[PDB]
Amino acid sequence: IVDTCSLASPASVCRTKHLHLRCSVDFTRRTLTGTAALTVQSQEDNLRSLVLDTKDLTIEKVVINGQEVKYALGERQSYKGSPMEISLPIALSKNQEIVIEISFETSPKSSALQWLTPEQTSGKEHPYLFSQCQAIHCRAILPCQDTPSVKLTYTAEVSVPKELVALMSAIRDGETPDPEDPSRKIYKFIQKVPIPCYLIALVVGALESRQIGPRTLVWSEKEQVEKSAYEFSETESMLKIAEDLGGPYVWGQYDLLVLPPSFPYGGMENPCLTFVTPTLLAGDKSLSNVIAHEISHSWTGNLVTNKTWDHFWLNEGHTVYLERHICGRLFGEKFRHFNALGGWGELQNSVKTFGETHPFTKLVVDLTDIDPDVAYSSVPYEKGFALLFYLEQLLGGPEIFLGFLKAYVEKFSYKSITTDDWKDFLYSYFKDKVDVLNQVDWNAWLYSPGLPPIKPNYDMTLTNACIALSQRWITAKEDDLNSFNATDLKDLSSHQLNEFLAQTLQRAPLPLGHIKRMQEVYNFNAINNSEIRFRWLRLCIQSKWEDAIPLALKMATEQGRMKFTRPLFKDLAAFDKSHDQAVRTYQEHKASMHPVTAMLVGKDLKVD
C-alpha cells in the first residue's frame, strides 16, 4: 500500500504522534507565521533523517534539542508541493521519539486557505480566514506527513487581532491577551483524539455563537446566527441516533460553523467543529441531510479512516449509508428509500458526465499523478452507498447490516484502513453468509468503471408523484400547457419538488414554451432553496431561456459551493447567448474566489 499523494516518509519509517502549533494570523500580509513542533516516533532502527510534505511554505529554521539542524527543500512536484528532508542530530532506535520544531510562514496563495477582505464578509468591517485541508492541503499550512495513514493529537495557540475570534477542529481551551502584543488575542485549543492531518482546521473572523443543544453551539457572523440556529436545530436529535448506530460520540463537542458563501463544499467534517455552507439556509430544515452526513463522519472517516485517498469511498460510502439511516429514523423508511433512489440518479448523472469508461468512475481509484481535487466527485459517495445498500439487501436487511456497521466502526476505530481490510472484515463478520458474498461481482463493483453491475431494489412510494408530474411535462404538447396549474404541487414536499426538477433536468432541454409555462404556473423563480433553484436554473439555461442568464450568473458568483458553481458555469458556457458573459464573469471574480474552486472552474471553462 503506497500513498501516491504524499512525498513524506511513510508510516513504516516514522509516525507523527503529536503536533504543538503556535502561530499568528497576519491579515496585512495574508500569512500564517509560526512554529510547528512535531513529536515523531521512529518505526525503524538507526533513523537519521526523514521527509515531510510542504506546499508553498517558507521555512525559517528547524530546531531539535535546542539547536538548529540541517534540512533541504526538494524541487516542487506540481500539486504535491516540495519534500522537506530533515537531518536528525542523533540516530533513533525503533520507538524512540523526538520533537522537531519547524519555524515557517505560509504563502498568500496557500492552496489550503481563503483570505477575505471586509467587503467579502457579511458585516463589512472585519476580514476573515478559513482553511480547507482535505485532501492534501494541510501541507500548504504546515510541514507534515500529509497522509491519512498517520494520526496524531494536537494542541494549538493562535494569535489574532483582538477584535476577532479563532476556532479550530479541537476543544476550546481559553483565550488571553497576547502577552507580546496588546492589539492581539491568543486563543488556545486541544485535540486529545488522534486524527489524520486533513482534519486540522482553522477559522478567524468576527464570529458569534448560539447554543442549540447540550453539546452544540452554532457559530457564524452575527447576521447569520438566528437563521443558522433554527436551520440546524435537529443536530442533537441526529447525534443521538448516530450514537445508537455507531457507538459513543468520542469527540466532546459537536459545534457547527457556517462559513461565508465561498466555502467549496456542503460540509467538512472537522472534528469538534463541522463546517457548513450557508447555502443550507433554506428556512425550513430541508437540507439537514448534510448535517446528518457530517455527524456520521464522527465515526466513518474520523474514527475509521481511509489509509490512502485511493480508498476514499470507505470514508464516503459508509457516511452516506449512515446519513440515510439517520434521516430514515427521523422521517421513515420510505423516505430513506426516496433518498437512496435519488442518489442512484446522481450516480447516473456522474457516470454520464465522466463517461462510462472513465477511470474516475471506479470505486477504488488510482491517484498516481492526479490532483485529488480534480478527481473529486459524487462517485465514491453514491457508488459506495449503492454497494452497501446492495449488500444490505443481499444479507438480510438494514437491522443486520447495521450490526456489521457498528462492529466495523469498533474494529477499526483510531486506525486507517484499505478496501481489502474492509472486505476481509465483511467476510469475517458474515462468515455464515459467505456463499451469498461470493455471488458479488467484487471486481466490477470495486475496480470497473461505469454503473455498477447490479441496481439495488428501491421503494417507489414517494418517488412516483415526482415521476408522474415530470412525465406529464415531458410528454405535454403545446395544447396541453394550459392544463398545468399551481395545484399540481400542493401535495409535494420540498424534497419531492427537487426530485421532480431532477427527473425533468435529466431529459433537458425542454421546449422553451414549456419552461416559460412552468415559471408562469409554479413561480420557481421565487424559490430560494439552493438545491431547487440550482436545478431549475440548469433546466432554464439548458432549455435556452435567455431570461435565466442573469439569475444563473448571479447564483454562480454569489456563492461558491462547487456542486452549484461548477455546473452553472459549465451550462452558461455551453449556451451561446451566455458563453462570453460566463468567461468574463469568471475572469472578473477569479482573484476573489476560493483557490480550489477558481482552479476548477478555470479548467471547466478552458480559461487560463
Ligand X SMILES: O=C(CCC(=O)N1CCC[C@H]1C(=O)O)[C@@H]1CCCN1
Ligand Y SMILES: Nc1nc(-c2ccc(Cc3ccccc3)cc2)cs1
Binding site for ligand X (CB under 6 A): 134, 265-269, 316, 378, 381, 561, 563
Please say which residue, 206 or 562, places its beta carbon nearer to Zn ion: 562
Q: Evaluate whether 258 touches 554 at the Cβ level (below 8 Å).
A: no
| 305 is a site residue for Zn ion (CB under 5 A) | no
The set of long-range contacts for 124-127, using a CB threshold of 8 Å and a minimum separation of 24, is 125/206, 126/163, 126/164, 126/205, 126/206, 127/27, 127/205
Distance in Å, CB of 339 to ligand X, minimum? 13
Can you tell me the distance from the alpha carbon of 281 to that of 227, in angstroms, rounded to the nearest whole number? 7
What is d(CA 321, CA 254) in angstroms, rounded to the nearest whole number?
20
**The entry of Yb ion, ligand Y, ligand X, none that residue 479 binds, CB within 5 to 8 Å by partner kind:** Yb ion
Single residue of 100, 203, 245, 379 touching ligand Y by CB under 6 A: 379
360's contact among ligand Y, Yb ion, ligand X, none, with CB below 5 to 8 A by partner kind, is ligand Y
Separation CA 133–CA 136 (nearest Å): 6
If the CB atoms of residues 185 and 561 are measured against ligand X, the closer one turns out to be 561
| Alpha carbon distances (Å) from 126 to 113, 205, 273, 282, 412 | 17, 7, 22, 26, 43
* Min separation Cβ 236 and ligand Y, Å: 28
At closest approach, how far in Å is the CB of 580 from Zn ion?
Answer: 36
**Residue 128 annotated in active site:** no
User: Which one of ligand Y, Zn ion, ligand X, none interacts with residue 378, CB within 5 to 8 A by kind?
Assistant: ligand X
Catalytic residue of the set 294, 323, 382, 392: 294
CA dist 312 → 53, 115, 324, 438 (Å):
20, 28, 18, 24
Compute φ and ψ for 448, nearest 5 degrees. -95, 145
Residue 419 touching Zn ion (CB under 5 A) = no
Task: Candidates 6, 16, 319, 529: give the one binding Zn ion (CB under 5 A).
Answer: 319
101 is catalytic: no
380 binds, among Zn ion, ligand Y, Yb ion, none (CB under 5 to 8 A by kind): ligand Y
Return the DSSP state at 10: P
By three-state DSSP, how is residue 220 classified? Answer: strand
Alpha carbon distance 438, 427 (integer Å):
9
**Going by DSSP bridges, is the β-strand pair 208-213/216-220 parallel, antiparallel, or unpaired?**
antiparallel
- Which are the contacts of 397, defined by CB distance < 8 A and separation ≥ 6? none
Per the annotation, binding residues for Zn(2+) are 293, 297, 316
- Indicate the annotated binding residues for a peptide: 132-134, 264-269, 561-563
- Reading the block at residue 414, the C-alpha cell is 483510531
Closer residue to ligand Y (CB): 221 or 371: 371
Q: Of ligand X, ligand Y, Zn ion, none, which one sits near residue 563, judging by CB under 5 to 8 A according to partner kind?
A: ligand X
Q: Work out which of 313, 390, 500, 536 binds ligand Y, going by CB under 6 A.
A: 313
Q: Any residues with CB less than 8 A from the CB of 276 and at least 6 apart, and which?
A: 232, 256, 257, 258, 259, 263, 266, 267, 290, 291, 294
Are 148 and 6 within 8 A, CB to CB? Answer: no
| Shortest distance, position 296 Cβ to ligand X, whole Å | 10
> Is residue 375 near ligand Y by the rule CB under 6 A?
yes
| Residue 477 binds which of Yb ion, ligand Y, Zn ion, none (CB < 5-8 A, kind-dependent) | Yb ion
In angstroms, what is the minimal distance from the CB of 297 to Zn ion? Answer: 6
Q: Which one of 94-102, 105-113, 422-430, 471-479 is the stretch in contact with Yb ion (CB under 5 A)?
A: 471-479
479 binds Yb ion (CB under 5 A): yes
Least CB distance to ligand Y at residue 93 (A)? 36
Q: Annotated catalytic residue: which of 187, 254, 321, 381?
A: 381
The Cα 207–Cα 167 span in angstroms is: 9
Shortest spacing between CB 222 and Zn ion, in angstroms: 29
Q: Strand 47-52: give its sheet, edge to edge.
A: 47-52, 84-92, 71-73
Task: Indicate the DSSP class of residue 353.
Answer: H
Residues 6+ apart with CB under 8 A from 343: 320, 324, 381, 382, 385, 386
Q: What backbone phi and psi angles, to 5 degrees, belong to 506?
A: -60, -25
Between 2 and 91, whose beta carbon lies closer to Yb ion?
A: 91
User: Rule CB under 6 A: which of 351-370 touch ligand Y?
Assistant: 360-363, 365, 367
Identify the residue whose cell numbers are 464573469. 585
Q: Contact region for Yb ion (CB under 5 A) — 44-52, 171-179, 290-298, 409-417?
A: 44-52
* Nearest CB to ligand X, comparing residues 187 and 254: 254
Window contacting Yb ion (CB under 5 A); options: 21-29, 46-54, 233-241, 313-321: 46-54
Task: Name the minimum Å distance from CB 222 to ligand Y.
Answer: 30
- Residue ranges of the annotated binding site are 132-134, 264-269, 293, 297, 316, 561-563
What is the grid cell recorded at 362? 471506479
| Shortest distance, position 478 Cβ to Yb ion, whole Å | 7
**Residue number, nearest CB to Yb ion:** 479
Q: Sign (positive/negative) of CA torsion 455, 457, 462, 464?
A: positive
Among 29, 45, 471, 485, interactor with Yb ion by CB under 5 A: 45
CA-based radius of gyration for the chain: 25
Candidate residues 431, 477, 490, 606; the one interacting with Yb ion per rule CB under 5 A: 477
Element (H, E) at 415: strand 415-417
Binding flag, residue 135, ligand Y (CB under 6 A): yes
Residue 274 as a binder of ligand Y (CB under 6 A): the answer is: no
**Catalytic residue positions?**
294, 381
Residues near Zn ion, by CB under 5 A:
316, 319
Residues near ligand Y, by CB under 6 A:
134-135, 309, 312-313, 360-363, 365, 367, 372-373, 375-377, 379-380
Residues near Yb ion, by CB under 5 A:
45-46, 477, 479
